[PDB]
């Protein structure tokens, strides 16, 4: 396991331009092509995106590439964040993967929200926080993924996502 894998599973890879919960054009694992209500516009950021005649579709790999760009973008913000930073430097690769997922899923601000939660992640209190995360709405709204992200903070192993 790795983050891409973990997100393919948590957000799924869509290989064709699709709309979101917000109705914005998206591709792969949440890559926002654009906020303009316009297909051809999507289809073009798309082409400038990876660069070629994809015509509303991409490769598993290509998608894979964007994701990377994305993941980076995220971490960047993450460092760029007062509240989060300290927590992530302290974390561990896998639990970092965990923090990305959330960040992926609810933006810094959001994650930045989970106060006492983050504290415990900091003091490496893997139980303390697990339950505390099970306590929020995020859990009720997205039971599973949230069940999983929490187990990955809990144990700090991909067990929850599976294996070979």
Swiss-Prot record:
Signal peptide: none
Root EC class: hydrolase
Cellular component annotations (GO), alphabetically ordered: host cell cytoplasm
EC number from the UniProt entry: 3.2.1.17
InterPro entries linked to this entry: Endolysin_T4_type (IPR034690), Glyco_hydro_24 (IPR002196), Lysozyme-like_dom_sf (IPR023346), Lysozyme_dom_sf (IPR023347), Phage_lysozyme-like (IPR052619), T4-type_lysozyme (IPR001165)
Reaction equation(s) it catalyzes: Hydrolysis of (1->4)-beta-linkages between N-acetylmuramic acid and N-acetyl-D-glucosamine residues in a peptidoglycan and between N-acetyl-D-glucosamine residues in chitodextrins
Activity sensitivity to pH: Optimum pH is 7.3.
Keywords from the UniProt entry: Antimicrobial, Bacteriolytic enzyme, Cytolysis, Glycosidase, Host cell lysis by virus, Host cytoplasm, Hydrolase, Viral release from host cell
Active site: 11, 20
Entry's induction text: Expressed late in the viral replication.
Name of a matching Pfam family: Phage_lysozyme
Effect in UniProt of substituting residue 11 to Q: Complete loss of activity
One Gene Ontology biological process: peptidoglycan catabolic process
Compartment(s): Host cytoplasm
Molecular function GO labels: lysozyme activity
UniProt: substrate binding residues: 32, 104, 117
Outcome reported for the amino acid change (mutating residue 26 to E): Complete loss of activity at neutral pH; covalently bound substrate
Hydrolase recorded as keyword: yes
Entry similarity comment: Belongs to the glycosyl hydrolase 24 family.
Function: Endolysin with lysozyme activity that degrades host peptidoglycans and participates with the holin and spanin proteins in the sequential events which lead to the programmed host cell lysis releasing the mature viral particles. Once the holin has permeabilized the host cell membrane, the endolysin can reach the periplasm and break down the peptidoglycan layer.
Protein name as it appears in the record: Endolysin
């Amino acid at each position: 396991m790795n983050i891409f894998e973990m997100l393919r599973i948590d957000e799924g890879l869509r290989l064709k331009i699709y709309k979101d919960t917000e109705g914005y054009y998206t591709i792969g694992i949440g890559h926002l092509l654009t906020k303009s209500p316009s297909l051809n516009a999507a289809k073009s950021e798309l082409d400038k995106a990876i660069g070629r005649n994809c015509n509303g579709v991409i490769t598993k790999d290509e998608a894979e590439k964007l994701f990377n760009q994305d993941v980076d973008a995220a971490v960047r913000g993450i460092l760029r964040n007062a509240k989060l930073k300290p927590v992530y430097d302290s974390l561990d690769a896998v639990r970092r993967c965990a923090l990305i997922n959330m960040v992926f899923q609810m933006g810094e601000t959001g994650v930045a929200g989970f106060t006492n939660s983050l504290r415990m992640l900091q003091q490496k209190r893997w139980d303390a926080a697990a339950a505390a995360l099970a306590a929020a709405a995020w859990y009720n709204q997205t039971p599973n993924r949230a069940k999983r992200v929490i187990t990955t903070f809990r144990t700090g192993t991909w067990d929850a996502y599976k294996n070979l």
